[PDB]
Structures are given as C-alpha cells and as structure tokens.
Design a protein around this motif. Structure first.
Motif, mmCIF file in Angstrom:
data_model
loop_
_atom_site.group_PDB
_atom_site.id
_atom_site.type_symbol
_atom_site.label_atom_id
_atom_site.label_comp_id
_atom_site.label_asym_id
_atom_site.label_seq_id
_atom_site.Cartn_x
_atom_site.Cartn_y
_atom_site.Cartn_z
ATOM 1 N N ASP A 1 0.692 -1.212 -0.154
ATOM 2 C CA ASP A 1 -0.014 0.108 -0.119
ATOM 3 C C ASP A 1 1.025 1.398 0.146
ATOM 4 O O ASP A 1 0.618 2.125 -0.882
ATOM 5 C CB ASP A 1 -0.906 -0.157 1.180
ATOM 6 N N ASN A 2 1.779 1.198 0.987
ATOM 7 C CA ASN A 2 2.849 2.482 1.099
ATOM 8 C C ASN A 2 3.798 2.105 1.911
ATOM 9 O O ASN A 2 3.996 1.813 2.986
ATOM 10 C CB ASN A 2 2.121 3.683 1.814
ATOM 11 N N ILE A 3 5.022 1.619 1.000
ATOM 12 C CA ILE A 3 6.114 0.668 1.645
ATOM 13 C C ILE A 3 6.891 1.796 2.363
ATOM 14 O O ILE A 3 7.549 1.356 3.327
ATOM 15 C CB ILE A 3 7.031 0.214 0.655
ATOM 16 N N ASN A 4 6.699 3.111 2.454
ATOM 17 C CA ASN A 4 7.038 3.986 3.157
ATOM 18 C C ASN A 4 6.535 4.130 4.581
ATOM 19 O O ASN A 4 7.334 4.269 5.450
ATOM 20 C CB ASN A 4 7.388 5.428 2.699
ATOM 21 N N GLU A 5 5.381 3.961 4.692
ATOM 22 C CA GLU A 5 4.464 3.931 5.988
ATOM 23 C C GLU A 5 4.351 2.599 6.341
ATOM 24 O O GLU A 5 3.766 2.578 7.675
ATOM 25 C CB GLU A 5 3.201 4.617 5.739
ATOM 26 N N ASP A 6 4.571 1.660 5.670
ATOM 27 C CA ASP A 6 4.411 0.229 6.115
ATOM 28 C C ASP A 6 5.679 -0.410 6.943
ATOM 29 O O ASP A 6 5.491 -0.986 7.837
ATOM 30 C CB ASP A 6 4.054 -0.651 4.990
ATOM 31 N N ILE A 7 6.900 0.165 6.567
ATOM 32 C CA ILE A 7 8.012 -0.119 7.123
ATOM 33 C C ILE A 7 8.778 0.764 7.946
ATOM 34 O O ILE A 7 8.990 1.819 7.218
ATOM 35 C CB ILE A 7 9.159 -0.795 6.191
ATOM 36 N N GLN A 8 8.701 0.967 8.860
ATOM 37 C CA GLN A 8 9.300 2.049 9.981
ATOM 38 C C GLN A 8 10.324 1.591 10.949
ATOM 39 O O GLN A 8 10.311 0.447 11.346
ATOM 40 C CB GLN A 8 8.134 2.758 10.752
ATOM 41 N N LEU A 9 11.562 2.302 10.910
ATOM 42 C CA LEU A 9 12.628 1.926 11.801
ATOM 43 C C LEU A 9 12.608 3.076 12.623
ATOM 44 O O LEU A 9 13.038 4.297 12.326
ATOM 45 C CB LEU A 9 13.968 1.496 11.106
ATOM 46 N N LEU A 10 12.761 2.723 13.912
ATOM 47 C CA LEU A 10 13.015 3.753 15.088
ATOM 48 C C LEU A 10 14.345 3.517 15.848
ATOM 49 O O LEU A 10 14.574 2.225 16.248
ATOM 50 C CB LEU A 10 11.868 3.830 15.966
ATOM 51 N N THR A 11 15.002 4.203 16.319
ATOM 52 C CA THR A 11 16.048 4.052 17.429
ATOM 53 C C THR A 11 15.272 3.751 18.778
ATOM 54 O O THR A 11 14.001 4.212 18.882
ATOM 55 C CB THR A 11 17.118 4.849 17.577
ATOM 56 N N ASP A 12 16.211 3.193 19.723
ATOM 57 C CA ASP A 12 15.559 3.034 20.764
ATOM 58 C C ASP A 12 15.623 4.440 21.732
ATOM 59 O O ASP A 12 14.740 4.535 22.948
ATOM 60 C CB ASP A 12 16.464 2.180 21.860
ATOM 61 N N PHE A 13 16.150 5.560 21.105
ATOM 62 C CA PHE A 13 16.238 6.737 21.656
ATOM 63 C C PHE A 13 14.833 7.510 21.619
ATOM 64 O O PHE A 13 14.245 8.123 22.313
ATOM 65 C CB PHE A 13 17.247 7.657 21.235
ATOM 66 N N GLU A 14 14.341 7.340 20.292
ATOM 67 C CA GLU A 14 12.971 7.841 19.998
ATOM 68 C C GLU A 14 11.869 6.827 20.263
ATOM 69 O O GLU A 14 10.749 7.379 19.806
ATOM 70 C CB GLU A 14 12.796 8.251 18.548
ATOM 71 N N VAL A 15 11.926 6.056 20.998
ATOM 72 C CA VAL A 15 10.848 5.186 21.587
ATOM 73 C C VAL A 15 11.035 5.272 22.955
ATOM 74 O O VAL A 15 9.753 5.267 23.638
ATOM 75 C CB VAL A 15 11.176 3.755 21.138
ATOM 76 N N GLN A 16 12.035 5.099 23.787
ATOM 77 C CA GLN A 16 12.012 5.334 25.420
ATOM 78 C C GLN A 16 12.068 6.685 25.771
ATOM 79 O O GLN A 16 12.318 7.512 25.103
ATOM 80 C CB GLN A 16 13.249 4.457 25.821
ATOM 81 N N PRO A 17 11.983 6.683 26.924
ATOM 82 C CA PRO A 17 11.863 8.225 27.588
ATOM 83 C C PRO A 17 13.256 8.877 27.540
ATOM 84 O O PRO A 17 14.166 8.150 27.117
ATOM 85 C CB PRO A 17 11.441 8.109 28.904
ATOM 86 N N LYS A 18 13.511 10.257 27.809
ATOM 87 C CA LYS A 18 14.748 10.828 27.783
ATOM 88 C C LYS A 18 16.021 10.063 28.652
ATOM 89 O O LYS A 18 15.490 9.730 29.782
ATOM 90 C CB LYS A 18 14.739 12.273 27.941
ATOM 91 N N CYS A 19 17.035 9.921 28.000
ATOM 92 C CA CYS A 19 18.131 9.204 28.478
ATOM 93 C C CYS A 19 18.113 7.936 29.198
ATOM 94 O O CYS A 19 18.634 7.417 29.794
ATOM 95 C CB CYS A 19 18.805 10.133 29.759
ATOM 96 N N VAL A 20 16.585 7.317 28.674
ATOM 97 C CA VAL A 20 16.486 5.976 29.312
ATOM 98 C C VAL A 20 16.770 5.077 28.153
ATOM 99 O O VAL A 20 17.133 3.737 28.261
ATOM 100 C CB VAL A 20 15.324 5.796 29.681
ATOM 101 N N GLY A 21 16.624 5.312 26.586
ATOM 102 C CA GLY A 21 16.774 4.392 25.636
ATOM 103 C C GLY A 21 18.304 3.747 25.529
ATOM 104 O O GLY A 21 19.097 4.775 25.729
ATOM 105 N N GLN A 22 18.599 2.799 25.138
ATOM 106 C CA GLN A 22 20.090 2.211 25.270
ATOM 107 C C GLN A 22 20.547 2.510 23.653
ATOM 108 O O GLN A 22 19.798 2.393 22.641
ATOM 109 C CB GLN A 22 20.093 0.755 25.409
ATOM 110 N N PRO A 23 21.877 2.832 23.483
ATOM 111 C CA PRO A 23 22.264 2.736 21.940
ATOM 112 C C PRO A 23 22.499 1.565 21.505
ATOM 113 O O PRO A 23 22.622 0.463 21.919
ATOM 114 C CB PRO A 23 23.784 3.315 22.313
#
Lengths: 53, 53
Positions: free
Chosen positions: A1-23
């Motif tokens: 349908d939309n390969i751009n909006e169907d497959i998304q990759l996020l780092t753990d920094f933009e998923v977890q709270p501030k200074c909580v996500g791991q590199p």
C-alpha cells in the motif's frame, strides 16, 4: 500500500523516555500483506438465451 | 434471380418483439421459380416466296 509508511525503523532513543533508551537498539515495524489461501470461488452462471432482450 | 434475396433465414428473435421470440425457432422464406407446364405454342408460319423483296 505504502512501503514508506508500512516499514518504519526507530532507534531506542525515539521510543524510550529521555536518557532511558539504550544505544544500538532498533525497533522495526513492518505491516506487510501476505498471500491468502483462497477458500472458495462462488461462481454464478447465468445462461442468456434471448437475442432481442 | 438472386439466390441471396430469394432465400432468407431469420431467427425468431428478429421476427417477434423484444424478449418475446423463442430460442431455436427459425423462419425460412424461399421465393423459388418452379417449372411451368407449357400450355400452347402459337406458331405463325410466314412463307416467303420473293427473292428481290
């Protein structure tokens, strides 16, 4: 349908709270469409015998 | 005279009104010329006796 909006990759920094996500941890969401089985074909035959209708 | 226009075949769909004709019914018109009997031969003998007329 939309390969751009169907497959998304996020780092753990933009998923977890501030200074909580791991590199080096990634979150990949893939909304794909697999082939379906194919269960039934409802065929509806309609013989036409008339020429002027 | 014209075998194409003397023999005509129509389905019942192009003869009857819409959705009224029945399938598998045909109308054949044949305008033929049969041999005639032969009734009389009116022979009219005309003896010619003159050479310069």
């Amino acid at each position: 349908d939309n390969i751009n909006e169907d497959i998304q990759l996020l780092t753990d920094f933009e998923v977890q709270p501030k200074c909580v996500g791991q590199p080096g941890i990634f979150h990949l969401n893939m909304r794909y469409r697999p082939p379906v089985r194919g269960a039934r074909i409802n065929v509806n035959m309609a013989p036409a015998l008339f020429d002027n209708c």
